[PDB]
Structure 1
Amino acid sequence: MFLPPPECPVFEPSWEEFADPFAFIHKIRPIAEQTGICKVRPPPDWQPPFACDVDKLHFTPRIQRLNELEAQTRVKARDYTLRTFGEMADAFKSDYFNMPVHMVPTELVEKEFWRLVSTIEEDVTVEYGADIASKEFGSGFPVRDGIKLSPEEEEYLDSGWNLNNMPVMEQSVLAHITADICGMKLPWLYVGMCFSSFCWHIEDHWSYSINYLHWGEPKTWYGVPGYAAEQLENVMKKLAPELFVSQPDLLHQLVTIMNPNTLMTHEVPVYRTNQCAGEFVITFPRAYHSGFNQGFNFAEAVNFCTVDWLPLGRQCVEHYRLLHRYCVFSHDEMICKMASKADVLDVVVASTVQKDMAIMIEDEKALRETVRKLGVIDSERMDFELLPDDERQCVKCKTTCFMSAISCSCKPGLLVCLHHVKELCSCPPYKYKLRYRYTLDDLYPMMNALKLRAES
């Protein structure tokens, strides 16, 4: 028996509201962050055309065995076209229920999905065209390509809700990052079939995500608000310990399927929604989510970070350090990059960056005084941004260094962050060297440019 969680908020913005996606996302934030996910219905006449061919685009989908509480890899079998996948998808659903595929009630698919994943001697597997790269396959939204594009797709070309634009706009703080993260600047495509699923997870660096269903049968979501993140993690710790064993890579994550009623039983707040074609779902920072597809469909998604998010981004990297988990990028390097472009930042952005930078500088000041008192005296400037990430990860906590690190001639090439000075080697501290990006004297004028910028 399944008792569906309460419905998450649904917004229908006017065209005035809709005009600026970052303004609207900020407006709804007090509501939507209480529930983790929300749904956004665009104005009725906002209807972007679809830019992908059914025969000339191929992919190999991941196989999915329907079993609850059981580890999978976050990123990990024949080849299909969009047409052949859809023929497979539709045949599966109609055969499964012995019905025409639109006559299957969404409530029934939902009951049946949760029955399926918890019943052990039913062996049902499905496939999911998941994590297909926008860059190779092509966006479902209109893009500029030196083909010609019809007028109607030229209106949608510059829309903030065109997901190609969202993470490159100026109120998105990830825009300024030069490093081709790709995992976080570029849209990803999901081709679903009935019962194909995504496990409970949160986004890298506790970022937002926005998901658009271009067409097909709905996508069912469950969401948990950010404030209940650790509570959900505690609940999952008791029931399925294996997922929490520290993984030796950022591409070795362990996620799982778990009944939202099990969470609700343990007083974790869960909300649901059926996202239909032409609707957006937004996930908020550190908000756990999971779900499954009702049928053959096509979705596109991207991460993004608002200025609202900057302090959480700092907190997240601190949390990764405690977990010894790899970073996608250095948060500090991103702050300093923006500071170095202070003359051309949005003024609200420059104001928010300056606030985070002040914390960075004070925390850096305290850490440096501490390693000095430990006997590290030798120091030398180092341009950390030039090192590939894997060559500047702390040996202990795996954090990507930028502000500073400790090295020793004893263990060449190795670095620790300043939290793990005692973890580098066994040589005395006077053999150590402090590598730093900036003197405190470099930092304060950078912050000043931001202040000047913000007060104009």
Structure 2
Amino acid sequence: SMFLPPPECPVFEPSWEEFADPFAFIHKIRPIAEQTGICKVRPPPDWQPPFACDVDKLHFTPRIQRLNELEAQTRVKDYTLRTFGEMADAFKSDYFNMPVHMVPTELVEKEFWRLVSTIEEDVTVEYGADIASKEFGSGFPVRDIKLSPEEEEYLDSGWNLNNMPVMEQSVLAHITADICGMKLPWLYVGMCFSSFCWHIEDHWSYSINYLHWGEPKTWYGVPGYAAEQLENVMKKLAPELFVSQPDLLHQLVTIMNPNTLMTHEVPVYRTNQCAGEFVITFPRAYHSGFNQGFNFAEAVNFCTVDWLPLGRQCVEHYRLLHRYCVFSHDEMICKMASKADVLDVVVASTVQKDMAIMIEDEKALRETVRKLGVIDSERMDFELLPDDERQCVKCKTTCFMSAISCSCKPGLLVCLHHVKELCSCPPYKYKLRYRYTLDDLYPMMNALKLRAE
């Protein structure tokens, strides 16, 4: 009547043999899990990474959160772990007039959706979210301090979320252009009702979340194929979230009842993630949720070979929306081509196919701007420019393969889709700036082909 819980998402329990290689495992479950957007992974019973920390020496600055459905929040923006924990336990204890382990999960869920929909309730909560640093580090073992033999067992686990971004079957690895918010783990300190709004990952990447300890985290997920249905439902009910934003640090997001989505025929799934379990989200899969109580989680983005074509589609979609990029997809592709001899052979093969499309599109774009009367040209090392100095004036895309400039407007650039948007001068005053000639590009793709055999 009031809240009807969505159906449960898939839960996998891999054997030690299946578990050994995360990328092989993720590829295996993909046909099931991409139908639901999120899934849960329970490691083998004896896989237990040790967790240890001083609750008095870890400090962090908390964010404050109002809990109202459809109200705008911004995506990104002092306690010790002990003092936060004391605040969190007392809050839950007093809210329900109960001891915390006796508060049923079904009840916290029901109550969460009651309180966010009710205008006359003004519940505020706090939480932590930050990338690993010296003041607050990874929950997984890392190399530095002498480690116990148990900790060194987990140092090079593929499921140690520090290693995940730099494994061989991973794609975001050899990226030199720093993208700190996308290759490093984030740490999250939760309390009862603190929540994460509906969103998808930057560049439509995968994400993987590990709950180290504490009370469960409740998740809702939507499969990738339904991303645009969800957005249309959201646009109708809260248009303010969809106005154009001046940068990446101004993304607007919101809390919204999954029953609202289910009423509009958007498929939604749920899960309670407990301590010691993994949740994985797939490309373009919308997700949100809330914490049941005091807890500690760690998460990281990643990109497999399966993702490469979607990554190209994502940047195209960013262009239509005038959304800023975190990195240049074409720059990453060419960086990998330049390292073709050390690439894994399946990677080399998949990169080669994306490069072939890149080259065909670039050929056609250069033919088009030549016919507009752009004649002069000069080579340019785009990867050396800071990102804010190579975004298209019109669509904000990060340039790499090519761009148009004019001496009339020093420093400004447009991508080749927006030649008409640079300035009022005739096109013979423009220059085509390019990273590679077509003749440079075909040998790069050939090296990939040889490596792939």
Contact persistence 1:134–1:189 (CA under 8 A) = no
C-alpha displacement of 1:137: 1.3
Supply the distance in 1 between the matched residues of 2:135 and 2:400 (Cα, whole angstroms): 32
Q: Which whole-Å deviations, capped at 9, do the CAs of 1:256-302 have from their partners, x for residues lacking one?
A: 00000000000000000000000000000000000000000000000
In the alignment of these two chains, the number of paired residues is 452
Q: Is the 8 A contact 2:324 2:398 kept in 1?
A: yes
Indicate conservation of the 8 Å contact 2:125/2:194, yes or no.
Answer: yes
Instruction: Report how far residue 51 of structure 1 moved.
Output: 4.1
Q: 1:379 & 1:115 partners in 2: Cα distance?
A: 62
SS of residue matched to 1:277: coil
Q: Assess, with a 3 A threshold, how the Cα gap between structure 1 residues 136 and 420 changes in structure 2: closer, same or farther.
A: farther
Distance 1:384 1:351 in 2: 26
Q: What is residue 374 of structure 1 aligned with on the other side?
A: 372
Q: Name the residue aligned to 2:8.
A: 7
Q: CA deviation at 1:136?
A: 4.8
- Is the 1:52–1:139 Cα contact (8 Å) retained in structure 2? no
**TM-score, normalised with respect to structure 1:** 0.98
| 1:182-234 per-position Cα deviation (integer Å, ceiling 9, x unaligned) | 11100000000000000000000000000000000000000000000000000
Shift of 1:24: 0.3
Query: Using the alignment, how far apart are the partners of 2:172 and 2:147 within structure 1?
Result: 28
State whether residues 131 and 181 of structure 2, in contact with CA within 8 Å, keep that contact through their aligned partners in structure 1: no
CA distance in 2, matches of 1:414, 1:432: 11
> Does the aligned pair in 1 maintain the 2:217–2:273 contact within 8 Å?
yes
Tell me if the contact between 1:51 and 1:139 (Cα under 8 Å) persists in the aligned partners: no
- 2: distance between equivalents of 1:134 and 1:359? 39
Cα displacement string for residues 158-185 of structure 1 (whole angstroms, at most 9, x for unaligned residues): 0000000001111110001011201110
Q: What SS does the aligned partner of 2:248 have?
A: coil
User: 2:209 aligns to what SS in structure 1?
Assistant: strand
Cα shift readout 1:29-70 (whole Å, capped 9, x = no counterpart): 000000000000000000001143211011111101110011
Does the 8 Å contact 2:219/2:288 carry over to 1? yes
Native 8 Å contact 2:205 2:307 kept in 1 = yes
Alpha-carbon distance in 1 for matches of 2:233, 2:166: 37
8 Å Cα contact 2:394-2:418 kept in structure 1:
yes
Deviation of the 1:134 alpha carbon:
4.8
Write out per-residue CA displacement over residues 369-395 of structure 1, whole angstroms, 9 at most, x where no aligned residue.
000000000000000000000000000
Contact persistence 2:128–2:189 (CA under 8 A): yes
Contact 1:167 1:175 survives alignment (8 Å): yes
Give the deviation of 1:130 after TM superposition.
2.0
Q: Which runs of 5+ in 2 are unaligned?
A: none
Q: Deviations over 1:414-439 (max 9, x none)?
A: 00000000000110000000000000
Q: Which runs of 5+ in 1 are unaligned?
A: none
**2:164 corresponding residue in structure 1:** 166
Q: In 1, Cα distance between the equivalents of 2:367 and 2:325?
A: 25
SS in 1 for 2:445: helix
In structure 1, C-alpha distance between the alignment counterparts of 2:140 and 2:310, rounded to whole Å: 30
Whether the 8 Å CA contact 1:52–1:138 is kept in 2: the answer is no
Q: CA contact under 8 A between 1:73 and 1:252: conserved in structure 2? A: yes
Residue 426 of structure 1: SS of its match in structure 2?
coil
Q: How far does the alpha carbon of each residue in 1:335-382 deviate from its partner, in whole angstroms, 9 at most, with x for none? A: 000000000000000000000000000000000000000000000000
Partner residue, 2:73: 72
Contact 2:393/2:422 (CA < 8 Å) preserved in 1? yes
TM-fit CA distance, 1:133? 3.3
Secondary structure (helix, strand or coil) at the match of 1:251 reads helix
Q: CA contact under 8 A between 1:51 and 1:141: conserved in structure 2? A: no
Structure 1 ranges of 4+ moved more than 6 A = none
- For residues 392-422 of structure 1, the C-alpha deviation after alignment (integer angstroms, 9 at most, x for no partner) is 0000000000000000001010000000000
- How far apart, in 2, do the equivalents of 1:52 and 1:341 lie? 40
Cα root mean square deviation, aligned: 0.7
CA distance in structure 2 between the aligned counterparts of 1:136 and 1:168, rounded to whole angstroms: 24
CA distance in structure 1 between the aligned counterparts of 2:350 and 2:134, rounded to whole angstroms? 31
**Distance of 2:151 and 2:278 partners within structure 1:** 19
Residues 105-162 of structure 1 show CA distances to partners (whole Å, capped at 9, x for unaligned) of 00000000010100010110000112343565110000000x1100001110000000
**Equivalent pair of 1:134/1:187 in contact (CA under 8 Å):** no
Answer whether contact 2:131 2:184 (CA < 8 A) is retained: no
- Match of 2:100, SS? coil
CA distance in 1 between partners of 2:131 and 2:6 (Å): 30
CA contact (8 A) 2:212 2:297 kept: yes
Q: How far apart in 1 are the matches of 2:123 and 2:132?
A: 27
Aligned to 1:21: 22
Contact in 2 for aligned 1:225/1:269 (Cα 8 Å): yes
The separation in 2 between residues aligned to 1:242 and 1:128, in whole angstroms, is 25
* Contact 2:59–2:135, Cα closer than 8 Å, also in 1: no
